[PDB]
């Protein structure tokens, strides 16, 4: 038989947020990026980084290679956090591993 209340494509997929409320939330998010306790608590390994906010010179701009990028992260205290990301990669449990995720 057919399902109860068959799903339709005219569900409300996309929801609108005020232009100003979007900007307010971005402002709050930016501020929190400058607080070491919150960047720690959200799971980033920031323990050899010199200063927050972490500003690096413009010479980084011109780099080219993933190997070049690796040195830059090492000269900061940033490569450890990139380590955790690469080491944590695994296959997604559940149905998503066959839904192109």
């Amino acid at each position: 038989g057919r399902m109860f209340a068959p799903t339709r494509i005219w569900r409300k997929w996309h929801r609108r947020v005020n232009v100003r409320l979007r900007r307010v939330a971005v402002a709050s998010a930016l501020a929190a990026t400058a607080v070491p306790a919150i960047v720690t608590a959200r799971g980033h390994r920031i323990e050899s980084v010199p200063e927050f906010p972490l500003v690096v010179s413009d010479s980084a701009e011109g780099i080219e290679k993933t190997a070049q990028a690796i040195k830059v992260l090492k000269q900061l205290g940033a490569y450890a956090d990139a380590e955790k990301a690469k080491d944590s990669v695994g296959i997604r449990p559940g149905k998503g591993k066959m839904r192109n995720r």
Binding site: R20, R23, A27, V55, V56, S57, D58, E61
Partner: protein, 50 residues
């Protein structure tokens, strides 16, 4: 976040300050908090309250 020096200096351009029409954005001013200093330690243990 790792900021480049090129980018960290544009932030004040992009978001401006507590002043009207300072942002690159139009019709926007940075939000002000409900509590100027959030230190309950300082307020509760100030001379005025004690």
């Amino acid at each position: 976040v790792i900021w480049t020096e090129s980018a960290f200096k544009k932030l004040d351009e992009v978001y401006g300050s507590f002043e009207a029409s300072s942002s690159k954005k139009k019709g926007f001013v940075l939000p002000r908090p409900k509590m100027t200093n959030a230190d309950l330690g300082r307020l509760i243990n100030s001379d005025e309250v004690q």
